[PDB]
Design a protein around this ligand. Sequence first.
Ligand SMILES: *[C@@H]1O[C@H](CO)[C@@H](O[C@@H]2O[C@H](CO)[C@@H](O[C@@H]3O[C@H](CO[C@H]4O[C@H](CO[C@H]5O[C@H](CO)[C@@H](O)[C@H](O)[C@@H]5O)[C@@H](O)[C@H](O)[C@@H]4O)[C@@H](O)[C@H](O[C@H]4O[C@H](CO)[C@@H](O)[C@H](O)[C@@H]4O)[C@@H]3O)[C@H](O)[C@H]2NC(C)=O)[C@H](O)[C@H]1NC(C)=O
Ligand code: NAG
Ligand code: NAG
Ligand code: NAG
Ligand code: NAG
Ligand code: NAG
Ligand code: NAG
Ligand code: NAG
Ligand code: NAG
Lengths: 113, 113, 103, 116, 116, 115, 107, 110, 110, 237, 269, 269
Amino acid sequence: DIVMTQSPDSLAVSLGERATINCKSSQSVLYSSNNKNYLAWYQQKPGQPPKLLIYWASTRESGVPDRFSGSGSGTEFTLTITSLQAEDVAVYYCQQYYSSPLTFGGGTKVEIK
Amino acid sequence: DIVMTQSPDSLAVSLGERATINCKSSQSVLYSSNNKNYLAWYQQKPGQPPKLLIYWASTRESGVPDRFSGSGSGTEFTLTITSLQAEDVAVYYCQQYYSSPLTFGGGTKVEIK
Amino acid sequence: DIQMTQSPSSLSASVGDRVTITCRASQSISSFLNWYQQKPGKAPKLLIYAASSLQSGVPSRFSGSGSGTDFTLTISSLQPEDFATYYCQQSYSTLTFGQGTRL
Amino acid sequence: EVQLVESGGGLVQPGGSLRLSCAASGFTFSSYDMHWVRQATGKGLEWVSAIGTAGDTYYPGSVKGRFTISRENAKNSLYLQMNSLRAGDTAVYYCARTWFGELYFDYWGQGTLVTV
Amino acid sequence: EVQLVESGGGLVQPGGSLRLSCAASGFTFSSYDMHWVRQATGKGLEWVSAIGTAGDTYYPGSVKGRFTISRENAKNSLYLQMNSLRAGDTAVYYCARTWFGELYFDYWGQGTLVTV
Amino acid sequence: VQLVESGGGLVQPGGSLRLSCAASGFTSSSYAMNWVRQAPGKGLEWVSTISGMGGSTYYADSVKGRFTISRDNSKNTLYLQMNSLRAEDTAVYYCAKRGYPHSFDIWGQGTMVTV
Amino acid sequence: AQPKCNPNLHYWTTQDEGAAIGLAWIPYFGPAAEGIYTEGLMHNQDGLICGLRQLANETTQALQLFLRATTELRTFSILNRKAIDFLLQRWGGTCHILGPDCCIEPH
Amino acid sequence: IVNAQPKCNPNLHYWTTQDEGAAIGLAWIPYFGPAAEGIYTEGLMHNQDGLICGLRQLANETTQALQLFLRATTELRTFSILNRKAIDFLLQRWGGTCHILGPDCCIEPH
Amino acid sequence: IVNAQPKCNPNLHYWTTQDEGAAIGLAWIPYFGPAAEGIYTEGLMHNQDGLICGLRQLANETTQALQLFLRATTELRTFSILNRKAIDFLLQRWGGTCHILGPDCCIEPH
Amino acid sequence: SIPLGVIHNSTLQVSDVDKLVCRDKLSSTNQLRSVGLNLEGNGVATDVPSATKRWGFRSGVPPKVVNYEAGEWAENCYNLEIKKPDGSECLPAAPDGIRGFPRCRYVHKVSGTGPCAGDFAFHKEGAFFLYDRLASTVIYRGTTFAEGVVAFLILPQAKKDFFSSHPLGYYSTTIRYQATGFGTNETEYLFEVDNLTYVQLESRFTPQFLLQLNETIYGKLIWKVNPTTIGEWAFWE
Amino acid sequence: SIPLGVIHNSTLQVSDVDKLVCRDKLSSTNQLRSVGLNLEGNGVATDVPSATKRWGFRSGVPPKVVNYEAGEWAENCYNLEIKKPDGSECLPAAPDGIRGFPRCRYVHKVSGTGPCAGDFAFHKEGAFFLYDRLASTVIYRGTTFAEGVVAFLILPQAKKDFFSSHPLGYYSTTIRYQATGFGTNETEYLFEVDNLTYVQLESRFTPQFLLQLNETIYTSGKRSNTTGKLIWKVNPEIDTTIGEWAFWETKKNLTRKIRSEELSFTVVN
Amino acid sequence: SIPLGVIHNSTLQVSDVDKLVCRDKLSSTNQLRSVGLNLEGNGVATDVPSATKRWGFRSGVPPKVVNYEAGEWAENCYNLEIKKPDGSECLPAAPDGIRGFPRCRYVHKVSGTGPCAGDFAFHKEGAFFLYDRLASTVIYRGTTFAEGVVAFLILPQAKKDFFSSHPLGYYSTTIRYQATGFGTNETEYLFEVDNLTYVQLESRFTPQFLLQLNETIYTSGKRSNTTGKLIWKVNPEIDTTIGEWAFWETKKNLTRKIRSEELSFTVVN
Ligand SMILES: *[C@@H]1O[C@H](CO)[C@@H](O[C@@H]2O[C@H](CO)[C@@H](O[C@@H]3O[C@H](CO[C@H]4O[C@H](CO[C@H]5O[C@H](CO)[C@@H](O)[C@H](O)[C@@H]5O)[C@@H](O)[C@H](O)[C@@H]4O)[C@@H](O)[C@H](O[C@H]4O[C@H](CO)[C@@H](O)[C@H](O)[C@@H]4O)[C@@H]3O)[C@H](O)[C@H]2NC(C)=O)[C@H](O)[C@H]1NC(C)=O
Ligand SMILES: *[C@@H]1O[C@H](CO)[C@@H](O)[C@H](O)[C@H]1NC(C)=O
Ligand SMILES: *[C@@H]1O[C@H](CO)[C@@H](O)[C@H](O)[C@H]1NC(C)=O
Ligand SMILES: *[C@@H]1O[C@H](CO)[C@@H](O)[C@H](O)[C@H]1NC(C)=O
Ligand SMILES: *[C@@H]1O[C@H](CO)[C@@H](O)[C@H](O)[C@H]1NC(C)=O
Ligand SMILES: *[C@@H]1O[C@H](CO)[C@@H](O)[C@H](O)[C@H]1NC(C)=O
Ligand SMILES: *[C@@H]1O[C@H](CO)[C@@H](O)[C@H](O)[C@H]1NC(C)=O
Ligand SMILES: *[C@@H]1O[C@H](CO)[C@@H](O)[C@H](O)[C@H]1NC(C)=O
Ligand SMILES: *[C@@H]1O[C@H](CO)[C@@H](O)[C@H](O)[C@H]1NC(C)=O
């Protein structure tokens, strides 16, 4: 049962500065057959349903701006916001669809300074 | 991956009596073929690089005094200082070298009383 | 199968010169190419054991060079007895020979 | 444009029964398998149920015997029926649409708060 | 006898690059496998890179693509090239030598601190 | 140290011929000897090889069903029984001994077969 | 009975042991899993190919039933069993010379 | 005889895998077919006491050789024993150099 | 001979699995039997250099065919080579249409 | 050199390989058959207390498996779920191919704890544990087996009267036991009549008596039960 | 009682086992061969929607594997990656020996989720899924296979004429399909031309057409739009049915080439 | 068509497939035998530094194994514990059936870290790795193996003449090595005399020499010290070469004995 743990519980970073959210999974979610990581990143802005930022660990949803970039392989992954505008304050979640339970990691809250 | 857990985060004990640090591994690091436990113990004094103390779970390093005694098997391990001295105050670490990611347990600090 | 090609079909050089003869394989052979020197009208003589190793008793001037797909042989000093034609044999499959090179 | 409307929710006594309805518009409901995800007020998102396109119901251990998920393609609405609700199941429930053939929830609906 | 010295630590802007150099003396550098170990101020020792005798490089997931380790045997030096550094990378970086053919770090260099 | 070839001559298209390669200074039984054919002016191609003891017989694609090759280890002699000779077979034949990359190392003097 | 029979058969088979002479027999210095196969096209005779396809379709009944009976996870003995049965039927016991049950040709 | 064993069962109720010819249905297809429990076919050999009471002895005697044979081979699961017995039977009848009159090979002259 | 091969070992000391007939004790039983290490037996064929040496040559020669056969086969574990050799031998000598007095068929009158 | 039995004229004579007798003919491979005859037929006690004595644990011997094409109905079959007092597995998990013995009238499902000296459990008498056309020298956890011995037969001349037709309705009852100290002489068995009610075992008890014990009875309770000789005849008798 | 086929004079007659004609002559095992003929040649439809219907799920039947020494090049092969809607495993993982079918011109890498009611997936028609010289009765996850039947042959020994001589590198394209409700009548397939564009799939569409659709979508697909993933619906507006003939027949016949203009695309919203 | 050796009158005639020689008689399958002959008997260098060079790592080729019914005692057998420099597994774990080579005079147990390019390790010489009646083309972790080739034999007349009796003690000593850069040209080995003392290893050193060195270190090598693990360079300072002859050669007699004084020790550093 893969359990996702996001390393920074909160991430205060100033406007326009890179932010990185780390995501460690108990088990590797890289699939050998296709060699593409079965992880997705969700953004939940306060008061709204979560939104799908990045899927396949790195692939970016069409609506999502270029700032959000997902990287990593195997057990641990990271989501990097190249420039953090104020409107990106939210709680960011991981998801693994490699295995049955489809767990989500504890949210990471990014706050502007 | 084996995740190493050292049970006593801080172990305040007076000088001259036994001090034991307990180390727990997620899955056993005892290799069947050689029946040798793939665990090592490191001592990091404040502001010095960590120095190896006990390797193969029980085998002691050449420099290390015989006061530092290590023991255990399978999943869980322990390090025992037969007589604590003022000089021994440090942060003691675990390592499991049985798997692909080399992992160090969270440090245990011993302090004189 | 793999096709063996020596790039210089014929070339002429004087004595005391540096010459390189190259044999090319269509698909990579793992340093399994051995060179043969055939004196005109006489049975061929092995030169390079496998891409680089020089046969015992063959003059040291002959130098074997090897790689994954492209092989070369260099004659250090071009003595008259070494002016004879050369061949390249692959040993990966079917033991074909490249078309001979004429000096 | 996929737009998901969720209904139901409110105060149900522990051990009571509730029905949550997720009406779906803007996409072919039959083609897409649908999931329920609940976010606890103080905890991260937890996946709580999934329905296949063929009506097969799949649940995690927590709600294995207590939750019944159903989709009726005809009226384009999806229901999660909750029985024997315990205090733990007091989260905000989101109906989510997995992408076609894939297990990441692309589209979510505004959550409905259930309090036990 | 065995002396490992770290160099190149400093302040690096987030997303920037830094190159760490480990000099070695008192042992045959070529034979032994050299490792870089990261110790955060409050998080304990963490293995961050490994270089083999033949130049083979192994990294954990965190620095799988960001970090490239290199050893140049002739000058008895070990090089860790850190790229795209993030806030998490700030720590004391040790160059360690595992004992011949085994994975325990017998000798540790005097640490160098890099801040992001 | 010496390999001797014999049996070459004039054979009309079709028919059979036996090429005898004999080993002098070598125990041919130990070494896997090979036959290499050089067409006049058209380069060298390998035709067949045998294992040292004679268990394994190996042939080229062209002569896969046409040539039968056998070794009499007792006499240190190799026999290549060419059969159903074709027009292109009118070439000198060399017998050689295997080497590190299945490399012909000691070459006996070639014999000429003409169709 | 078959609706459409492909007249031409393009067959991939494992390489002939005799064919390989290079030091590619060595596993380390050798072709990967993809390379082993050797190609062929039996386009000359349509009737043979269509017979083969019909034969395969008919045999699958027995092959499946035989698989059901056997406890083999991986059954590699069908060909050997066919050879043994062929020999056992031809020479099971007491062949009669003149008799055609066992056909041994007197001069 | 089966005198050695304390008691020999006169009736032998045997279960065997289904006869290939027996199944004429479209149940040959694995998907549309009986599960593992149902494949077996049934029989009774109660009539012959002598034959079965002999078989039980034959099994009892042959386990001695069978266990040694299993010890020798490194087969995790051994399925070639019947094939090897067939090969031995053929090789015994027709090893080579058959003699028409001689008992070594067996083909009645007329 | 084997001088093609650099050095030939004059002595062959062979370890083999035990013969089925020799063992009579109640050690055939797996529970009471020898452990994996003890099943083996010993022999020495030092007296005859020629046969064993030839044998080393034969093994060096046959390895090529063995490797190619393994490459063609999909067997993870191959234990049928000896049986296939046996069936080849029988199929070859007695394949069919064997003349009573012919090269193809071993049979010989009287 | 496995003994091979030739059945001719409904009489079994073990084949004499040396004599090369020509009465037998092996027309087809079908005539060759391997039959697994249950050990209970030979007359040994089949109840769990007696049967357990035969099973023993040894280490250092690799398990071996042989297939038997045909088998015999087993009056008593055993299913073992023995865990060491820790819970560590005592019997190897069943391999993929292995399946429970079919056609068992009574399945004695023994679950409990016992010392397990060996890696594998072996039959002291030298017999095979029979699993669904696979005879194994070892016991596999959770898989129904019947003690038996495999015999190899040459069936008669493709007449197919034997083992293809009966020359001349499957219900399986799961008897359940709890055991401690399994695999040693100090083993105690209490039969599980019901969830809260258990009866302590004796060697004399037969499956029929155990089945009636449920009717007889009407904080888990262990009942000592006393009912000459019971079931002196074998199951067939 | 497996039927054995004897090839006499390039004519195939099933062996008269009961008749025991001596004419057939098995010199050595090399003569004996097993051929994995694929169903694609048999003329059954090979498109993913129809082909999937043949495949079925069952539990309680153990997988069985057979060895076929030689085999036939297959126009269409499949690589299922089905997962249950939870994410739980559906198709059993491949065993060590099993590998993808060699020599597949088009590999239909179906991916997606479906109800899996059985431990293993079986062929309803009774055929064998073929994997790299190991025919199997079940579908293994992630390994290319071509559904087929295995035939046992006694080859003639005259000059190794068959399978060793031509009577007289391959490029495999992976067509990726995204699917829901795999293994049921409600299955829906999207062909994945690109990561942001998908075209709803119909049975009539053939692999050649699909690749042509890939090219036409490249020009006018409007793939690079931030709106989201696009499920296009495509109709070839031509009088005749696309892919009427089989692959062997269609190459013999004059091929019909569909211009980009004829294809019609409607966004599905 | 693997060559099948025929033994006639204690003379090895390899069989001729086509000939079907009348003379040879195969009475039963017992006569057929497979023999696994070690490479050490073939005069190849057998010391671990040279032997490792012949082994090599490649990926993309499946491992295959064969059974050899009988085998030859091997003077030198190797057991590998290689791990990648980060601690990842390099050599596949042994399958259940595979067990260590039965009879080994010297078991060279190599435990160390090396670049591990391929999935599996293969013999560059084409030979097999012999494991307890199983001949494999791939090295398996932690199982004693002796590299060798498998020969198939038709034994003579099954008259107990061959492999049934000796026509005419098993003590195995483990030489423990530690290696870095295993499987590459730049490989260094340390002979492990004991926990705290290691000796740099060269090809010249033979197992008898290494055991003598172990004794010499124990008696007078001052192995125990507080400095740390000691790596000693050792050279036998005797005019003659060390162990030129093979184990069978000259029955290893009249061989100069290198008294403890002759060996010279210096500390590498
Ligand atoms: C069955 O027996 C045969 C016969 O003994 C074995 O053949 C041996 O093969 C191995 C490797 O396959 C060779 O080792 C090589 O040594 C090379 C150094 O040169 C050697 O060559 C000589 C061989 O002499 C014969 O061949 C030459 C060449 O045609 C002829 O001129 C000569 O007349 C003979 O016909 C030896 O005499 C000499 O002393 C040397 O030993 C190395 O170059 C070679 O490769 C190395 O380097 C490669 C490139 O870097 C690298 O890829 C390799 O891994 C390796 O590092 C290899 O070490 C033996 O020399 C060779 N013996 C003979 C007598 O030919 C065969 O291996 C064996 N097979 C089995 C399964 O048992
Ligand atoms: C080596 O270490 C092992 C493990 O602690 C120990 O059993 C052995 O006695 C030690 N030997 C020496 C010579 O220190
Ligand atoms: C059980 O066996 C052990 C070992 O032989 C013995 O010590 C003990 O006395 C026995 N107990 C009984 C009750 O048989
Ligand atoms: C009794 O135990 C059975 C299992 O043996 C279980 O299924 C059943 O629910 C139990 N019933 C009660 C009343 O405990
Ligand atoms: C599919 O089949 C099921 C039977 O399992 C049936 O109930 C359902 O109506 C069918 N649906 C369609 C669209 O045919
Ligand atoms: C088809 O699409 C792929 C990507 O989906 C692209 O790489 C390729 O060029 C396209 N055309 C062909 C003919 O494959
Ligand atoms: C599209 O997907 C492929 C994998 O199918 C991936 O390699 C490629 O980088 C992706 N590109 C974009 C732009 O998403
Ligand atoms: C070892 O092999 C590598 C491979 O290229 C080479 O670079 C290196 O120089 C070699 N070492 C020696 C000492 O030859
Ligand atoms: C040789 O080494 C062994 C262990 O390998 C050790 O027990 C022994 O003491 C050593 N020799 C001597 C003479 O001490």
